[PDB]
């Protein structure tokens, strides 16, 4: 398929999503709930948001909300690392599940999980009217590289589209980690496409230090979404170049996707190597360097650290599919 065939069917296959209105307004009152419950834990504890919602400007169907709670202190030290400690991780639980029982006495309705099986203490939260998110507590880092992105898609606003289309795809192939047998997160495909978009100059290298969460929004404005005005000629050209990219000029062998550093960064400049691999274990299990996609803010997090040779194997094969089929749109 052209360009502009894929351009097309990606238009059709969003026009219910640009149906319905975009607007992050309906975050608020989710907000204001969520607030009411921390309030209750500690008036002087704040909110903010992440994920999806801060990214795009955009909120999505079938997407949480990402909260965190933080203290003013925390908020301060705008720039401070992430403490990966047994006891940061406690202080973490302790108060999530004082938070998790405020939810549950406020709200008799929601089912609030106290999700252990992570590197970071969660708590998820489902009320029904898709009333969906997930709580963590005193981390700047998802608030960051949330900010982080969100910056570099103000730079070039439709480029989102292209970023969405890899979201849903990844998903709909079972890649994105929200499926059984999925490997890379959507917060890894964000940063596989930022890095594509940036050794192609749509965007503008910015240095992932230059984020400051004492100057971020707790709730960011929302950014409107307009429809690829050129019949979606862009998202299409995008797209297979963006496909092209990852199956033929990207060496996964020897390179690692990063937003750390314009330019390219080595597998060996980081000892992202086979003999790393013998040595590196995350939440108890084996760390993988077959795809390599560098964590701008936590030290030594391969984001693609479950893309073991198969699921690698996997991803090329969805990536070749992915031309012929316009991101499973030409079925
Ligand atoms: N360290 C690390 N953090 C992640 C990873 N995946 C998600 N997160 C954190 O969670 C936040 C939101 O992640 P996601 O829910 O996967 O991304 P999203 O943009 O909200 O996309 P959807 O919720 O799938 O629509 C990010 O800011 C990340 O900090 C990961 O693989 N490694
Ligand atoms: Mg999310
Ligand atoms: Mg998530």
Known sequence: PSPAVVGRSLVNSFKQFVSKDLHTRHVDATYRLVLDCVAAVDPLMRLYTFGSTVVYGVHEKGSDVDFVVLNKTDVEDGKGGDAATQVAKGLQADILAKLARVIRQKHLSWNVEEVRRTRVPVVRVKGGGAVDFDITAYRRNGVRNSALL??????????????????????????????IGGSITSYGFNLMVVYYLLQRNHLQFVPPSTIDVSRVEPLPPHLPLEEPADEGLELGTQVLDFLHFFLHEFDSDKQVISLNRPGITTKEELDWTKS?????????????????????????????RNVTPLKRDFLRRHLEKARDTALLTIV
């Not at 570099?152 to 929200?178: D, H, V």
């Open 150 to 179: 969100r910056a570099y898609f103000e730079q070039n606003p439709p480029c989102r589209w292209l970023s969405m289309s890899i979201k849903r795809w990844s998903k709909q192939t079972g890649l994105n980690a929200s499926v």
């Open 276 to 304: 790393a691999e013998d040595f590196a274990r995350m939440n108890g299990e084996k760390v993988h360097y077959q795809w390599c996609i560098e964590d701008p803010y936590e030290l030594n997090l391969n984001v693609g």
